[PDB]
Amino acid sequence: DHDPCHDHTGRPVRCVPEFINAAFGKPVIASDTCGTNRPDKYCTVKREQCDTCDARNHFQSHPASLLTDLNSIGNMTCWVSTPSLSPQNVSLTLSLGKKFELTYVSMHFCSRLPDSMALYKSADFGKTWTPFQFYSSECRRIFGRDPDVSITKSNEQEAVCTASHIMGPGGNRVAFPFLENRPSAQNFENSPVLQDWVTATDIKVVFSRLSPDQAETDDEVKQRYFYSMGELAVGGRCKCNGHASRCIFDKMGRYTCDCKHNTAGTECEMCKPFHYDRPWGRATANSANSCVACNCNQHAKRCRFDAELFRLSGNRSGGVCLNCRHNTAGRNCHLCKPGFVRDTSLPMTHRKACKSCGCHPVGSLGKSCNQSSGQCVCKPGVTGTTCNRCAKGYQQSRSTVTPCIKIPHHHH
Template identity: 25%
Template sequence: MKRLEGRLRFEMLAINCALIVALMHSGTASRCVDLACSPPMGNLASGRTLTTLSGCCGNGSHHSPCPTPLHTCPDHLHPPVHMVDDPFLHPDTWWASGMGTDQEEEVRLDLETRFCLTHVVLLFHSPRPAAMAMERSQDFGRTWETLKLFAQNCSLAFGLPDDTSQPGSLCTSRYSSAKPCSRGEVIFRTLGPGGLVDPYSPEGLSQLTLTNLRLRLLKAQTCPLSVAPSTTSSSMGLSKPPADLNLPLLPSTSPQPSSEAPASAPFSIYTLLARGTCLCHGHAEHCLTHRGGQDTLKDMGAWQVCVHSPHSRRTL
């Protein structure tokens, strides 16, 4: 085993050295000349296993706490992996919770090292939760910090003001309506509208970095019996994020939302996009997966190795 680990380390070092040499002798100009530099953004959830509470019955979830005794569930037609498959190739696949209507659910993304997270976008198959918490850990799940709370009534659900009336509040009602019945979005930005002057400063790193992401789906809701036609982007089945997110459209070929809720689990999600990149402290133009391939915008899976740019002037 030690001999194998040593060989893998040597191979990684060789790959890094070869790529650095190629960059130094490349005819194309580096985008890191005299600048701080980071690898391209991607979906941190892509290529990784998402774990869920209802999955403790045998769909690949292993984190605590699992219910005791474990759930007995039928063949899982809508496993968690459907949240991170390519939404362009598989627009009509989704994850469905195995929990009951009055039970809480949890979706968790575990990373192998620290990454930078900029945005989270959820596209729900079911009506969006009436109450939900988004949390992160920076110490591999030992402690958790709330990033944002979502509720129809922030005061009733969490005892907090709504950020629609009190900007800066930890809770928002913006993404908790039962309408549309399907393909409703939840969007979270790690940084506020003002952003940060230096994302690599201690303040910036404390806001951006994480090792784990957890979504606690606290209260389900059903679709209203009567829904007036809507011309919003979500109700038209085309997910159009705000322009400042600079995110790709999430495609849709499903029927437009109707007045009847889909016959499905209390919580179900088409797509989980956790947009971020490797934590390279402004020194790297690329990062490599453990398989040796360069980063891509579609797949940030597996642990990453930063490939430092000889042109970057970033100093710690």
């Protein structure tokens, strides 16, 4: 149908997947959920209102799945942690299944806004995590960071910690935009540091403290300390480096880019086989940086990119063909192997572009012949196109070093 990766004439152009809420309809894995072991009373103030949380009944259950489901206008389904007068180390983990480039992470809390939480991302499918924003009324003591550290050109990946969520304008909704206040934001397409900043395969929210212990048996106030949230939204695009308009499931089940521009890899981050004439690049407004096919004059199955050759060509071509067949030779299989010669009547792409020199081994000095006329390298006294007969005045000797000696009594 419509390929947004080529313009109406067919020229390659930059293309990106559509911007989505990439959290939506994906599992969130909570470290703790109320009503898991036994019913649990929890209470929220508005007058105080208590409910029972029991995971065995749908009307009483608050699983993490509620975080990325469809919400009704006055009916927000909320996940709820287990009431404890000592709540901490409670985490939510979301797998995107694929690298995305993220614009924002939004959290819509239900009861109270948590005092201290940390946002992390992974870019290796959960193997490792780095922070990217903190929230706390005591950044220094809790998270070992100064509050509201200024972002300069020399710390654009700063993971800021702030207490400004507390009476913030979003109320119970907290949104972190990845590019806000980043100096290189307007130069994103030429900012590897920012391109790294916004790349993630997973997100993780870690809650450390509900309140600074500033907010009747203890079973009663226990029913007020709990984490609770109804909407986890992660806005971004599937990362394809400008070389795909959509991501798909291939026939092996992998979620991956629908790579265009003769690229390959799950992120279109390398060139396809036999497309190694130019270095890979990310597409930009100026140019798609489409990978370029090697030229092996129909004589080679594989090729490789040689960077120094590319730099010597004037940054034009850099593919080196591998194992040229059919007695061809050269980095483009554009020449003839030693002992062969360019059959001019056929094209270089023909399976018989290079015909044997046919040089008679005894009368010639080398197997290789004149690449233009085919004439072989004749020893003294030898003549012929392939140096296979003695010249006038010479006669076949016995030695194979000098097979033609002068004829005695023959005038020269």
